[PDB]
Amino acid sequence: IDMPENSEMKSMKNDAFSQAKFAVENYKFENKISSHIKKFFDEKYGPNWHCVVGKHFNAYVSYDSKNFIFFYEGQLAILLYRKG
Amino acid sequence: KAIINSSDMQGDLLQEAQDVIQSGIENNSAPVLNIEAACKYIKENLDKKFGPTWQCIIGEGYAYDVTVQNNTLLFMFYNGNLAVLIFKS
Amino acid sequence: IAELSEHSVNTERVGMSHKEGGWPFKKRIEKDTS
Amino acid sequence: QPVIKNSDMSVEMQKEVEEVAKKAIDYCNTDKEIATFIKDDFRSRYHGTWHCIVGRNFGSFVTFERSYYIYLYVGQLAILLFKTG
Amino acid sequence: YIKNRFYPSKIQKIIKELFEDRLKGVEYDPNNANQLSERLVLELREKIKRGKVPRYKIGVQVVFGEIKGQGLRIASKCLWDVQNDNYASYTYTSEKVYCTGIVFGCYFE
Amino acid sequence: QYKTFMGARVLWPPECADDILEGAIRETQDALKKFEIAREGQKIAEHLKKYMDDHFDPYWHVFFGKNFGCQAVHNKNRFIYFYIEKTAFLMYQTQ
Amino acid sequence: EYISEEVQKAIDDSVKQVFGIKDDSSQVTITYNKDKVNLWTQQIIDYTIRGLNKLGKHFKYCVTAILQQTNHAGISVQITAYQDTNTDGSLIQCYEINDIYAIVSVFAMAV
Fold it and tell me: Which family does it belong to (chain A) (predicted)?
């Protein structure tokens, strides 16, 4: 229902979905899921990212424009954004 | 001989629920069968298939009063007189 | 520059199933009552 | 005459189960009223969400919290109490 | 037998809060430095009085001075059965003064 | 053994420092009492971390709820862990 | 019945009297020397122990010294022991002039 945006070309938006869908099924604890997503995106694009996983939580962060992705993945909710 | 009595869920899961109760009948089809083993099988199968928090109940004369998630409830009857309720919570 | 660290957080988890068995007497020995 | 067949609670919470069951038997003749008595009693004394089924020919499969489950026979009634949420 | 125990960082708590709210960025005036220490040492002692340790004896110690082109080293040693007795230590330094406090704790027996 | 504090049950002794403690031990219930209700979620922790970053060191992390428990490594002596009316609060600062 | 602050004062007296000069030029005409470092270590230790036995205290001491050539390599000095609360303890000290990184570590115990 809610899909904050990022850069065009679907360079990172298409990536985050495909990665997080494997992450969620592969693990039970949020630790491995979020660490997997962040560790991958660090190698892939950026020096420092930030990822949050959970059923219910609210947040308010500073970040870099067009580098803030947020999506309701299944029953879970996954937030991600670059910072640093 | 499945006779569905009260439906709430989606027709696909309807079909699979019928198939699973049938398979449970065949798993326990003998005068020594117990409805409890078939109940274990139904609930565990619907767990490993469509997710946990399933609940299987079998009998012919009883009175339940339970809380169920929407589109996750079924109750039905058999020509063999087996009233079967299933629901997710 | 400044130093760094890794506060790796978790959640403490408590989950175990039993099998309820239907009826098969209040007194273990029926002969005592009989 | 309560007959515990499968319980998870501590001995005190079990004793409370059978005491509340005896009271519900003393007061309410209908199984629904008995089960609501027990369920509301435990949901009030503790906090969370309890569920109680009362029957005579009954099987199920449910998840439940740890040490928050009993299946027993008080007199000649099948009481299945548990806590989920 | 130690039901109520001492861990370092509630005295470390008290000592931090005390330091900021009492020092409030004071300069090192020579005529009142020793008496400033005398005041805040006793205030700290009062705080550990409610510090909720019945048998833990409290060896309060405090250092206060000014930093002026001045290298310094302060260290202590711990001398007890690690199961019961413990210590606590805090530092607090502004642009031109530094105040650091340590508090021992020894379970009486 | 989770000793009592004028604010709440705090794991005594903890791993943090008292301007942070007293600040949190007053600010958590001050925040919850003034105009805030348990019905709302992390718009509490929002103001909590904001208040902490305003006065105290800037990089904080707050986790509160009814079921959680953590190991980790952080800045020395920056660990607030206290229950209050069956609600665990955990806070830690990371450089 | 002592103070490690004064123990450190005595160590400082010893070291800064032996080699430390207020006027800072002879301290680099005296740079680290492969031939003279043996004399340095031995005489620093001997003068320090003479300062220590000037004290009539009945406590028992033991001493260790480290002399580093240059700051490029880096070093970590750490201490730990197992003794009695009231009277025992230890002491450390780091020292730098121009090109000599001295470190002293002393243990003081009862009896």
Answer: Belongs to the dynein light chain family.
